[PDB]
């Protein structure tokens, strides 16, 4: 016997998914009551709501073996249940798709595209995804009608191919494209920050060499390397993760402190060219006051912001990877055996339960990758 095992699996999975999603949604609401609400909160909350939809529509009917034994009831009940199941599946896929699109928007081209965003837990992409999930699952009202309930129907193979293409292959390919684009952008930002760090390092090393230099050369020299490093550094604009507008600190406060820095380098070079090495040493010390004012804080801020966006992108990538690895085993079976296909694919429940494990584990992934929810140890 294996029906009891399936029932126990479904019961524990419902418990886990419902509890985790409810706890994370409650933490989101609590943090919203404070001044710690963020744009990503709507996306995570609606992904949680899609997970609850999966739990209550796609998992509850199967768990109840006194109601899914023969799907007793009027055809309206079965039609509604199947429509809700497909809506939940579409929503679970497309909320992750929307999250990845949000990452692409807020990393590749972080503009003021959060129009009509609100703390009421809704925005344009998520409502678009929900509406698309509702529309694309409409065909489910014209298939299942009190057949025990069964499909009423080339129709089956074509429909299953369409479902796997719309729910899994197309969203997954879009997500993969967005992820490769985001990876490229993040690598570009990392390389730019590494270049700025290297320029700062060259500045510091040549300052040390000037401090320990004892002749005209190594001062006239090692100031040219500093000047080249400063010229290269002031050109490096902040990554797309931060805005670039006039009066911004990064436009004036950064490339004005660098102007004073290069001016002091020029003064040191002017002194060195006259043989006044001792005088040129004083400019070396003078340069530190400008070095530690405009640039060190900018480097710290850039590193911290890059780390934060990298953490969010890693969270999204983990969610996507779990999504694919948990849903592909189920969709592939249908795709391979829905054509009447080499044989009959007897195992059905376990694959769908494994798929729902993804919805079970999303809230844990978010909490692990989120400091706001991680600090919510005491409830």
């Amino acid at each position, epitope marked *: 016997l294996l029906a009891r095992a399936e029932l126990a699996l479904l019961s524990i999975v419902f418990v886990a998914v419902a509890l985790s999603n409810g706890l994370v949604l409650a933490a989101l609401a609590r943090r919203g009551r404070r001044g710690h609400w963020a744009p990503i909160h709507v996306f995570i909350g609606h992904l949680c709501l899609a997970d609850l939809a999966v739990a209550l529509f796609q998992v509850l009917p199967q768990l109840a073996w006194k109601a899914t034994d023969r799907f007793r009831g009027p055809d309206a009940l079965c039609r509604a249940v199947k429509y809700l199941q497909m809506v939940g599946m579409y929503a679970s896929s497309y909320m992750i798709l929307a999250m990845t699109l949000d990452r692409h928007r807020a990393i590749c081209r972080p503009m003021l595209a959060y129009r009509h965003g609100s703390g009421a837990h809704w925005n344009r992409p998520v409502l678009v995804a929900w509406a698309f999930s509702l529309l694309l699952s409409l065909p489910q009202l014209f298939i299942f009608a009190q057949r025990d309930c069964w499909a009423c129907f080339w129709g089956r193979r074509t429909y299953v191919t369409w479902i796997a293409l719309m729910v899994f292959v197309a969203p997954t390919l879009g997500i993969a494209a967005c992820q490769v684009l985001i990876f490229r952008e993040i690598h570009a930002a990392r390389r730019q920050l590494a270049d700025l760090e290297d320029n700062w390092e060259t500045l510091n090393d040549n300052l040390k060499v000037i401090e320990k230099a004892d002749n005209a050369a190594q001062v006239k020299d090692a100031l040219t*390397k500093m*000047r*080249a490093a400063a*010229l*290269d550094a002031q050109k490096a604009t902040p990554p797309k993760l931060e805005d670039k507008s006039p009066d911004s600190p990064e436009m004036k406060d950064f490339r004005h402190g660098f102007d004073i820095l*290069v*001016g002091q380098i020029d003064d040191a070079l*002017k002194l060195a060219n006259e043989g006044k090495v001792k005088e040129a040493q004083a400019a070396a010390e003078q340069l530190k006051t400008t070095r530690n004012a405009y640039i060190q804080k900018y480097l710290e801020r850039a590193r911290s912001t890059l780390a934060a966006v990298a953490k969010t992108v890693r969270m999204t990538l983990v969610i996507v990877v779990v999504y694919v690895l948990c849903w592909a085993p189920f969709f592939l079976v249908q795709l391979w055996a829905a054509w009447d296909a080499p044989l009959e694919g007897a195992p059905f429940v376990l694959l769908m339960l494994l798929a729902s494990l993804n919805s079970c584990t999303n809230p844990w992934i978010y909490a692990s990758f989120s400091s706001s929810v991680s600090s919510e140890l005491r409830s």
Partner: antibody
Amino acid sequence: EVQLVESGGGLVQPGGSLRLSCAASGFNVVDFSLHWVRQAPGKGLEWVAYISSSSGSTSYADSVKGRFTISADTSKNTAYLQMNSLRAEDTAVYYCARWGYWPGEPWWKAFDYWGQGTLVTVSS
Amino acid sequence: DIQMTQSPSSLSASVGDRVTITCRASQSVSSAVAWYQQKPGKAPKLLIYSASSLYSGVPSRFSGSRSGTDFTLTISSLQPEDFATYYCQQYLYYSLVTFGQGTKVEIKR
């Protein structure tokens, strides 16, 4: 309109002395550093000297240091280059170029208004 | 003492032909590199005033580019009046300006 005009080039025996005057019109030498760049007959350009009138910060190339003297007169808005102890390879066409100051874009525009160039030949 | 070697000592091309000239610097100067054009008996003419920045009055066919320590000047549609020597200067500091040896572009036949 901006224009540099060179004068003073001519024939001087080796070991003699010469003076090259670069006159600027359309701008003040105080706002720009005036460089002297010489090109030998059938050869590439090479930088000879420069003067910054605001700071009085002269400079010279390793092959002319100690023999060339670059000065500037803002009243006449001209730059003078006095060449002494001339040698055989000092023969060339000397252009007077103009270079902005660091703070802004005028610096990032390298020599952008050259002069006509004056030819000096030294031979026995 | 920053060398500015210009590899193509001379180059032959025909009208409508893309021509590329390269320059390499001993140290790592910044985008402080300019490209000039000199015709026989005339003072140079600032074509590119940064690593890649067209001057005000230069035709748009000229285009400069930089990659690390290697700079390049490219002419897409070589016109009959694009035949002239081309020089590559590094101008990191007032007393550190050095030119290249120059490439003479000639007509093909």
